Amino acid sequence: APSFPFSRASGPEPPAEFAKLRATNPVSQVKLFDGSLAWLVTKHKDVCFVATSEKLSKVRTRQGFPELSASGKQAAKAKPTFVDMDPPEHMHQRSMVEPTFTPEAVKNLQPYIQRTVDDLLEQMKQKGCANGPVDLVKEFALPVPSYIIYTLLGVPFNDLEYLTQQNAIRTNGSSTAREASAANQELLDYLAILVEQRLVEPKDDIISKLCTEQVKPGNIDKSDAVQIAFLLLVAGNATMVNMIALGVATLAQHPDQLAQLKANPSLAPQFVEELCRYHTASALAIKRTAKEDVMIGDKLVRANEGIIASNQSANRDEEVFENPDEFNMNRKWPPQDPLGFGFGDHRCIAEHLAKAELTTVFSTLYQKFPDLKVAVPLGKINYTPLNRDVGIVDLPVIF
Ligand code: HEM
């Protein structure tokens, strides 16, 4: 059994194993870091089944849960938030924060999303690139999702830049373990203080809603509120940064489609849909253990055996998406959903927010900077390490 996670075939490409497995062995066994074996599911239809089957559990203290590293194994010891819950606990806690992320609520946020993107682009213009390329990640891709989610949680404007840097340190590939865990503690300590404050005078933010509607009535206590707030910050931020940067790089690689976006900014939604299918930047989140024996394709998965469902592979499934390895913002979409945000009850709570952010970025960026160019040869883009989710570490641009 091959070791899993697989390595990406190159900087921007999924692992090569997935296409071979989809063709010849779509439910197969892989070997995890600790020697245990898990089942790997690669076809779109089977990923949807794993994501919705009531016979499968996300509870991480069940025998067989497929942790992919040693830190995940010890993270499993902490009190769980709704990301690691089964029904009915899952929606009980998830519904406490879902009102901010509904399509209606995200529509109302759209002026603020646009103002945030406008302000950060205007700052980048004023900085200019007269002394060399600037890093689109540090200058734009990182602060846009960071400022928005921090602001929604309730962080005041003056604290945004420090906390944005600290959260970046958490996931930066060249951080030492001491740097990353110190940045992590910095974030937890700040959120605990913000929770204490909102308990005394609530404002109009997510932490205030939790303190007022759940902590004070006793449905959760203030430490749960910290954990839930922390989850909403760290679950998707690094992914948002990577999606923005991957979108720019992808458009640099497909000049004809960038030309269409420049001439019709209203194509941004379709560009975003294809971006999230093609670059599945969160590919290791759909993991389960079997509560009972369950049949998947031609394989029997026994109780207490772990399953990993690759939405990355599913988003390249030849049986669902015609020419899946071509980036084509003008593709015709089948009835099946792309799985960039997962599927079923656990499907990304922030799907609408994430897409609204991505759509605002790509309908604005080239209107502001019509000559935005990646400043290094495209073959020299600094992608994330091949053993990690696809992403871009830094992206020098001129404009
Ligand atoms: C483009 C950016 C994003 C992508 C591609 C993405 C992708 C995903 C994926 C694949 C999952 C697993 C869903 C499943 O189990 O079926 C997920 C879950 C989640 N995401 Fe996102 N996400 C993004 C942005 C965000 C943001 C901005 C936030 C927070 C504000 C967020 C919070 C979450 C949470 C809390 C979960 C767990 C939901 C649950 O188990 O009920 N994500 N996301």
From Swiss-Prot:
EC number, UniProt record: 1.7.1.14
Family as reported in the entry's similarity comment: Belongs to the cytochrome P450 family.
Annotated organism of origin: Fusarium oxysporum (Fusarium vascular wilt)
Cofactor(s) recorded in Swiss-Prot or TrEMBL: heme
Keywords of this entry: Acetylation, Heme, Iron, Metal-binding, Monooxygenase, NAD, NADP, Oxidoreductase
Purpose: Nitric oxide reductase which is involved in a dissimilatory reduction of nitrite. Acts as a nitric oxide reductase. Is able to reduce nitrate and nitrite to a gaseous form of N(2)O when oxygen supply is limited or discontinued. May function as a detoxification mechanism.
Effect of residue 73 to A: Decreases the NADPH-dependent activity
Effect listed in the UniProt record for changing residue 71 to G: Improves the NADPH-dependent activity
Protein name listed in UniProt: NADP nitrous oxide-forming nitric oxide reductase
One protein family per Pfam: p450
Induction field: By nitrate/nitrite.
